[PDB]
Design an enzyme around this catalytic site. Structure first.
Site, mmCIF file in Angstrom:
data_model
loop_
_atom_site.group_PDB
_atom_site.id
_atom_site.type_symbol
_atom_site.label_atom_id
_atom_site.label_comp_id
_atom_site.label_asym_id
_atom_site.label_seq_id
_atom_site.Cartn_x
_atom_site.Cartn_y
_atom_site.Cartn_z
ATOM 1 N N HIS A 101 56.909 37.926 27.224
ATOM 2 C CA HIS A 101 57.091 39.254 26.584
ATOM 3 C C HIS A 101 56.275 39.294 25.295
ATOM 4 O O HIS A 101 56.704 39.942 24.319
ATOM 5 C CB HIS A 101 58.565 39.531 26.279
ATOM 6 C CG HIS A 101 59.448 39.511 27.477
ATOM 7 N ND1 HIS A 101 59.964 40.659 28.025
ATOM 8 C CD2 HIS A 101 59.920 38.492 28.226
ATOM 9 C CE1 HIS A 101 60.730 40.347 29.052
ATOM 10 N NE2 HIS A 101 60.716 39.025 29.199
ATOM 11 N N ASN A 174 66.296 43.579 30.591
ATOM 12 C CA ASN A 174 65.082 43.943 31.351
ATOM 13 C C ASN A 174 65.280 45.326 31.953
ATOM 14 O O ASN A 174 66.392 45.857 31.876
ATOM 15 C CB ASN A 174 64.784 42.900 32.420
ATOM 16 C CG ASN A 174 64.008 41.736 31.855
ATOM 17 O OD1 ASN A 174 63.501 41.815 30.740
ATOM 18 N ND2 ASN A 174 63.889 40.660 32.618
ATOM 19 N N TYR A 388 66.116 30.594 23.058
ATOM 20 C CA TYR A 388 65.700 31.634 22.082
ATOM 21 C C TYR A 388 65.729 31.046 20.668
ATOM 22 O O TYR A 388 64.801 31.335 19.913
ATOM 23 C CB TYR A 388 66.494 32.923 22.240
ATOM 24 C CG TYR A 388 66.139 33.698 23.480
ATOM 25 C CD1 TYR A 388 66.567 33.258 24.720
ATOM 26 C CD2 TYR A 388 65.367 34.847 23.428
ATOM 27 C CE1 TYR A 388 66.271 33.956 25.876
ATOM 28 C CE2 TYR A 388 65.052 35.554 24.575
ATOM 29 C CZ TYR A 388 65.520 35.110 25.799
ATOM 30 O OH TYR A 388 65.233 35.754 26.957
HETATM 31 C C1 HEM Z 1 67.706 37.715 32.999
HETATM 32 C C2 HEM Z 1 66.881 36.843 32.451
HETATM 33 C C3 HEM Z 1 66.115 37.104 31.241
HETATM 34 C C4 HEM Z 1 65.951 38.255 30.543
HETATM 35 C C5 HEM Z 1 66.504 39.623 30.863
HETATM 36 C C6 HEM Z 1 65.148 37.931 29.431
HETATM 37 C C7 HEM Z 1 64.766 38.899 28.515
HETATM 38 C C8 HEM Z 1 63.871 38.651 27.516
HETATM 39 C C9 HEM Z 1 63.312 39.612 26.671
HETATM 40 C C10 HEM Z 1 63.597 41.080 26.656
HETATM 41 C C11 HEM Z 1 62.472 38.978 25.842
HETATM 42 C C12 HEM Z 1 61.648 39.633 24.761
HETATM 43 C C13 HEM Z 1 62.384 39.748 23.408
HETATM 44 C C14 HEM Z 1 61.449 40.432 22.432
HETATM 45 O O1 HEM Z 1 61.021 41.584 22.721
HETATM 46 O O2 HEM Z 1 61.101 39.857 21.363
HETATM 47 C C15 HEM Z 1 62.490 37.623 26.181
HETATM 48 C C16 HEM Z 1 61.759 36.676 25.535
HETATM 49 C C17 HEM Z 1 61.917 35.337 25.804
HETATM 50 N N1 HEM Z 1 62.662 34.764 26.748
HETATM 51 FE FE1 HEM Z 1 63.684 35.678 28.014
HETATM 52 N N2 HEM Z 1 64.834 36.647 29.450
HETATM 53 C C18 HEM Z 1 65.379 36.071 30.508
HETATM 54 C C19 HEM Z 1 65.338 34.742 30.913
HETATM 55 C C20 HEM Z 1 64.800 33.740 30.143
HETATM 56 C C21 HEM Z 1 64.947 32.369 30.353
HETATM 57 C C22 HEM Z 1 65.682 31.727 31.492
HETATM 58 C C23 HEM Z 1 64.283 31.743 29.320
HETATM 59 C C24 HEM Z 1 64.188 30.340 28.942
HETATM 60 C C25 HEM Z 1 65.162 29.528 29.248
HETATM 61 C C26 HEM Z 1 63.796 32.730 28.485
HETATM 62 C C27 HEM Z 1 63.095 32.446 27.375
HETATM 63 C C28 HEM Z 1 62.541 33.445 26.609
HETATM 64 C C29 HEM Z 1 61.660 33.136 25.484
HETATM 65 C C30 HEM Z 1 61.228 31.796 24.958
HETATM 66 C C31 HEM Z 1 61.263 34.311 25.000
HETATM 67 C C32 HEM Z 1 60.380 34.462 23.807
HETATM 68 C C33 HEM Z 1 61.346 34.146 22.669
HETATM 69 C C34 HEM Z 1 60.912 34.635 21.325
HETATM 70 O O3 HEM Z 1 59.844 34.242 20.824
HETATM 71 O O4 HEM Z 1 61.654 35.423 20.720
HETATM 72 N N3 HEM Z 1 64.112 33.929 29.012
HETATM 73 N N4 HEM Z 1 63.354 37.440 27.206
#
Ligand code: HEM
Ligand code: HEM
Ligand code: HEM
Lengths: 725, 723, 306, 83
Positions: A101, A174, A388
């Site tokens: 993202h 999402n 996160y």
């Molecule tokens: C239903 C599953 C998931 C959804 C809905 C989701 C949703 C999101 C969203 C909306 C963002 C963007 C936040 C922003 O705009 O700054 C994001 C970033 C991220 N997600 Fe997910 N995510 C999911 C699963 C995962 C999983 C399983 C992982 C890791 C274990 C993960 C790791 C991350 C990371 C590392 C970022 C960037 C973090 C940051 O720099 O703030 N996500 N996710």
């Protein structure tokens, strides 16, 4: 002394429609628009006007055009501290982008609930209808970098930071209600597969390559979120016209300790609208910033994006009532079995001042919950809580990311945490530990309670062995892809077939293509055959005999899963292109605009060149863009008024604009001689979706606005294969 | 969990009187504009709920979330992970050099306008008050190293002026070890712990340092200052500060005046002796950090006089040393130091990491009215101080760390970088721009509030890596320093060399350094060689001494003690109690100490209380071993039941330690029995105050010696005493 | 510049003070294990090499900056100076939050006999099986620049390079710890650490905040007893015991679990300083434990633990 | 320094020289080279001053700047020949 004397450099601090003025930072654009988060940020804003230019140390600069040198034509000197600070700061501008993202667009807003929910949750922000909570929202794509295009086929992120009285709550959602994988442990495998391939770093913002479809083919749990992606859900018209979802089951906790299962929903008040793929792919070329731009302009216009927060609610004793596991994040809860009840309204009413300071540095974590909410053992969600906070140590350069202004709570924060890189807070506490007597043990623990209580976990029973093992309850993959598929209109179903077909066509190894097709035979044979035929694959007899999956708790279909089965169109904030000629009929253009203004519809005035044209009656019309400069891709509808049509009749770009709009299923309106254009799009009695009249009658404006309300002209699809656009 | 008192009084109090506190709690009424500007980020604690960093109230800060009381810890405990994560990421890199330092807040003001020689705003008006923040430091050691090492000392002053930050980053000696900034890593690598085994800490007494010195004689002048008592100051309040480089003053007409910067301690110059300093690294590694904080809480504010050495431009070639050479000093006998202003440090910080550890100084941070020179040590420094802050403080926004921010306005086109705090609303991030009417705007140079413009110095040469032949003289400033010391200071310099080279493993290195010392002074060269069992050759004995410096035979400003400057205020005395103190004696000591602002610590063989003969109850500050003589300026024994402490090993050793360290000792009444432990004749001697009771006469004697700081006549006697 | 007699160390075991100390590969080249051999690819020599930039460019003059004439201003275009100062400006990394002060050495471990009956860990599978190790000994409270002979707990961390992966046994010289739950580690560590306002004192628990926490949290008292004892000041890293502290599990081929606690026993036995001696030694040589460890290994008096 | 995370970016393999590289530079984040030089400084006698300065020569010499004549005053000024 460099500004123009007519003052045309400065925009107006008034709501103006897209293209009217230069866009400005939100506090200049709209100074009277305020909330507690935005007022709290005043202490860090820097101005510019009537300020001496200085170094970061406050030393005024005499000459910002030159390096200090030993002579005019001399070598540059090490001692030039003004040069080096300037270059040094420039050399260190960039920070790591988000692993996922990375591409996102954001705005300030406020949230208000309709009524106290204190019966089911003790969260302060849902406690009263008069409680108004500031938010900051970032919408995003998933696969691409910060510099990738907006209207790719991908999932969209919908993350919301609620700055509440009892802490920050981040709702990180999402735009589809499920995810591709069951278990957090495989997030890197799935993200590595969709991402650009590691040898040559290709391709950007596209799932249409071999490694993604290889992973999907070998992990059928993916197929339900893939259907959504291959649907028109994958390419929305705007962030304002898509649904948001929490995806996981979470818990609500009330004052008695009673736990209610919840799933979160954002419903767009402007309704659900999507692009079509040819239009979307082309728009990444014509305007890769299309979603980011549209959103800033909707807000500068007053077309405030609005969403309604919705809860799906399930009693704890109801955990096993469905055919699917509530903890399974590849399954949705159909609205037919569990309805969404409206909880509140979120309104995004102000743009940021500095994109890097506020959007790029903003940090959401779904682990940020407040008393009155809690997790579940959803094994995707369990894994997200680690990630996160871990990622911010590198991305935001240390554990003090909460002191970055956008991320700061409005509510008070006090603990024994100390130091770390870029530490801003100067603690006066004699003690950096508890228990302590030297500060009387302040700051102190608070026991849990109905209001302003300390956070305590719900006391969920845990029985079983330490295992790395997938619940057998998760081991069903085809029935939800099928429910989704049967819930779509036939025109949505072709769009899904065409998405699979296009993406698989890009897949170099044919066996990967054949395996994806074999997976589709397991969801529905009609969809499976339509794809195989576009790929020149023939289903075997075994494949023809695959028994369809169960329906979901007896449902044949759910229409809340379709973007269009139940219309919810609102024309406010849409845009029409108006194609001028060198002698426009003033009467037509007068009527056209007053009809659009009345319904909050915007227009852009287009010509074969920039500057001004004069209407038949002498009126000077300024020109917003060229036909090539703002193509049909960027508008909802096209209106051609009457005038000297001969002027544009043989214009290549003017005819193509109509053909591009027509192929993409957009409403088209022709007045007077403008009807002669009916020949370029091969339309004479006329057809549905071409509005024609002697003049822009007002009935004519009513027919056009009604079509815009239905977003696209679906009846038109059989005709567009013929048209070479 | 609660309080009983725990809380110190917000009033000046003497060391050990009360617990130490953050400066804003200890002295809330002590203010300057820099201190007020920091209120934005001060965080309180009293009557606040404990929370996460996201503002969420914590119910239970004693436990991890687990599956059952005796179960595994759960990944979903975000409270635990946030708290552990912040703990796991507390540390940042320490400074490459001057990692060990101690800091405080203060204000500066000029005695009079210097508009004649400089258009710099902060020297412009004697009623403009400039806030300062000052870090003192050692050089070699880590942040976790000891204060009282034999090292150079850093004296860095940040001025928050109305036209920008000015950082005067000086040392406590007027010269440096090396001529050209290109050799800074070779020099620092050689003085630092050796790369294979990382030994030793805060010491130059190892092979790689003396190897570099022997091959680089430009080093010998700053080595002389280090091996002298200048190397081990009694306190930061009692050492000199130097800019070291020639610098420029620019006035409104564009006239350039050469300047050297001086700090003069109003508490005067005082140093330890080496055995005490080395041992004080064991008993209290934090002795300077502590002495400073308590001195300020006591109200004994560190005070310094800013001094200029000034040379007109046409005088640049008038000495037989080069002004741009930083291994040469300008003798005060040739060029006197003109008093410019006073600096007063009147408040400690609240948070050591927040304010001291993250403070960033740079010699490049200058203001209009100042400029540089082609001194090639300084030319290199300009690059380094900005470069190093990118890693140490995590990015180019280190000026938004609150201690670092200017009090004056700062506006520019600079954007982004890690941990960006400033949110810019300027439509333009470039100039020239029409969209903001080119704001923020350049300012032309002028007498006041002008933009910075470099002095238009004429440059004529080829591009060369060449050392100026004018720099290639190395011995006359070491000899000028040697000849300017008191005999007892000369004895201390011999001993510094003797002790450090005695720790050098390779003898050829010890013999090499003895050869360089022969080029400075054969008396000094022969005293060191005798201590190492080296014997000078005929060639060595016949080496011609270096020239005088501009006909100078000695300069007494170069000695710590040659001209007395001592002030007793803020010094401490040890008082050794017995279980029946003669209240008469104690009453009179405390009244005389107080009238001169001298602090006292009451010590016994145990903690708690003893009772005086008239029934007064005395709290005990520390035991004899808990606060040894190392930590006080003099020692007093009043009368009472002396027999109580007469046979006490620790009570006897305390005097023997103080006596060896040349400290004034006062014995009242029966406490004269104690003269036996230190082998003093009945008649007594200078440095041992004695009387039947502690009369008015007795305290005058003690206080006059304390003003002379140490008892130097004692030295011939100290070699025989074992301590 | 070297002395003609070559007295600038012999590659053979020599007693403390006899010769100058040297890097391990120079001092004892014929001492090898598999980890040390694997490190040859990153070992840099010096003799016979031209002094160069990091980009491999030969330097003509390493005593001077490039300047516009003899007494001229230094020039930005001097890439040789800027590379050198830049690398110097960036030498330091953050120290360990805890156990910042530490001393280490290379070694090997063998089991006396096979332990297959109780664990399937490959490094314990056959008698006399050699696993390379790297061991770091440490204090806890002090920074990297703090003194060795402080009153503190000592760290005994062992890295085992096994055929089936790295095993790190991260131990202390006492068999318990101060606190029960990891949630309170930062509270306890802030308490024993130098106090936040003035960052005093270094490498000591002898201040108010340490004992205030001990007074309000009596679970701490067992490890406080060990620390207030002569255990708190070992004579040597060679002369202290090592403990894992936690109960771990051994798991065997059959899947049977056995509870286990780890011990290191010094073959040189248990010996300690006395406090007045140890406090003075922080003054006379703050590197005493580091030096002794290094010279013991140069002398062939190898730290041996069971 | 920020982008590749420290002063050892030359040790990232694609960045590494194929020619020999030896100097007195030590430490920095993620240091790969283990230096065995008893000296981390020059001039040194403990390693006989290795590694050594090379005099400039036609082949395999030390780098020496071209001795260009500089005549001017210290100015932030654009050459009028540029305008
Ligand atoms: C239903 C599953 C998931 C959804 C809905 C989701 C949703 C999101 C969203 C909306 C963002 C963007 C936040 C922003 O705009 O700054 C994001 C970033 C991220 N997600 Fe997910 N995510 C999911 C699963 C995962 C999983 C399983 C992982 C890791 C274990 C993960 C790791 C991350 C990371 C590392 C970022 C960037 C973090 C940051 O720099 O703030 N996500 N996710
Ligand atoms: C005139 C001789 C020198 C003096 C008086 C001097 C003074 C100082 C002082 C007082 C500090 C500590 C500042 C603080 O408390 O934060 C310091 C640090 C430092 N000095 Fe120097 N210095 C000298 C020479 C050099 C040279 C030649 C270099 C060459 C590059 C250099 C580079 C540095 C660096 C990198 C730091 C650490 C900066 C930081 O982390 O903030 N110094 N110096
Ligand atoms: C029985 C309890 C503990 C023992 C025996 C122990 C042992 C050690 C040892 C020996 C080291 C030094 C490793 C080295 O030489 O580099 C160390 C470092 C460390 N310990 Fe512990 N420890 C204990 C408890 C804890 C707890 C509860 C935490 C955190 C919750 C913790 C966090 C750390 C950290 C962060 C380091 C720094 C390690 C690094 O930077 O690589 N320790 N510990």
């Amino acid at each position: 002394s460099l500004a123009p004397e007519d003052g045309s450099h400065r925009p107006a601090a008034e709501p103006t429609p897209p293209g009217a003025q230069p866009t400005a930072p939100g506090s200049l654009k709209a100074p009277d628009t305020r909330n507690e988060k935005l007022n709290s940020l005043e202490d860090v804003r820097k101005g510019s006007e009537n300020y001496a230019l200085t170094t970061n140390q406050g030393v005024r600069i005499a000459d910002d055009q030159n390096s200090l040198r030993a002579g005019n034509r001399g070598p540059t000197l090490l001692e030039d501290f003004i040069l080096r600070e300037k270059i040094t700061h420039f050399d260190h501008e960039r920070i790591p982008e988000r692993i996922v993202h990375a591409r996102g667009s954001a705005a300030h807003g406020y949230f208000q609930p309709y009524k106290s929910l204190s019966d089911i949750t003790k969260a302060d922000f849902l406690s009263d209808p008069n409680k108004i909570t500031p938010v900051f929202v970032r919408f995003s794509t998933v696969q691409g970098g910060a510099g990738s295009a907006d209207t790719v086929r991908d999932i969209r992120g919908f993350a919301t930071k609620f700055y509440t009285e009892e802490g920050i709550f981040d709702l990180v959602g999402n735009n589809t209600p499920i995810f591709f994988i069951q278990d957090a442990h495989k997030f890197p495998d799935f993200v590595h597969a969709v991402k650009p391939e590691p040898h040559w770093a290709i391709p950007q913002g596209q799932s249409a390559h071999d490694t993604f479809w290889d992973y999907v083919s070998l992990q059928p749990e993916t197929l339900h979120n893939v259907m959504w992606a291959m649907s028109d859900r994958g390419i929305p018209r705007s962030y304002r016209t898509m649904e948001g979802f929490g995806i996981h089951t979470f818990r609500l906790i009330n004052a008695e300790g009673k736990a209610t299962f919840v799933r979160f929903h954002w419903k767009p008040l402007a309704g659900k609208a999507s692009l079509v793929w040819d239009e979307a792919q082309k728009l990444t070329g014509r305007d890769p910033d299309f979603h980011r731009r549209e959103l800033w302009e909707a807000i500068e216009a007053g077309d405030f994006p609005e969403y309604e927060l919705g809860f799906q609610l399930i009693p704890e004793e109801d955990e096993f009532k469905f055919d699917f596991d509530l903890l399974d994040p590849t399954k949705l809860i159909p609205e037919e079995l569990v309805p969404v009840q409206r909880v509140g309204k979120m309104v995004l009413n102000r743009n940021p001042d500095n994109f890097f300071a506020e959007n790029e540095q903003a940090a959401f974590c779904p682990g940020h919950i407040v008393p009155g909410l809690d997790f579940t053992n959803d094994p995707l969600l369990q894994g997200r809580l680690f990630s996160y906070i871990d990622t911010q140590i590198s991305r935001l350069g240390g554990p003090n990311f909460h002191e970055i202004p956008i991320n700061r709570p409005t509510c008070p924060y006090h603990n024994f945490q100390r130091d770390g890189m870029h530490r801003m807070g100067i603690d006066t506490n004699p003690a950096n530990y508890e228990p302590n007597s030297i500060n009387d043990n302040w700051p102190r623990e608070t026991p849990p309670g109905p209001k302003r209580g300390g956070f305590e976990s719900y006391q969920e029973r845990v029985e079983g062995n330490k295992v790395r093992e997938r619940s057998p309850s998760f081991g069903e993959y085809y029935s939800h892809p099928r429910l989704f598929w049967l819930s779509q209109t036939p025109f949505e179903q072709r769009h899904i077939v065409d998405g699979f077909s296009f993406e698989l066509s890009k897949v170099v190894r044919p066996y990967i293509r054949e395996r994806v097709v074999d997976q589709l035979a397991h969801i529905d044979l009609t969809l499976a055959q339509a794809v195989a035929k576009n790929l020149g694959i023939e289903l075997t007899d075994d494949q023809l005999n695959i028994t369809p999956p169960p329906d979901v708790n007896s449902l044949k279909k759910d229409p809340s899963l379709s973007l269009y089965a139940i219309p919810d169109g609102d024309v406010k904030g849409r845009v029409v292109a108006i194609l001028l000629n060198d002698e426009v009929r003033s009467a037509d253009l007068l009527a056209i605009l007053k009809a659009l203004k009345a319904k909050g519809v915007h227009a852009k005035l287009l010509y074969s060149r920039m500057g001004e044209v004069t209407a038949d009656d002498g009126t000077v019309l300024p020109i917003a863009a060229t036909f090539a400069g703002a193509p049909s891709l960027t508008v909802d509808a096209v209106i051609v008024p009457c005038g000297n049509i001969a002027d544009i009749a043989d214009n290549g770009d003017a005819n193509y604009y109509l053909m591009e709009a027509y192929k993409h299923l957009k409403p088209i309106a022709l007045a007077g001689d403008a009807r002669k254009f009916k020949a370029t799009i091969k339309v004479d009695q006329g057809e549905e979706g071409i509005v024609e009249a002697d003049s822009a009658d007002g009935s004519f404006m009513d027919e056009l606005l009604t079509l815009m309300a239905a977003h696209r002209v679906w009846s038109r699809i059989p005709k567009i294969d013929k048209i070479p656009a």
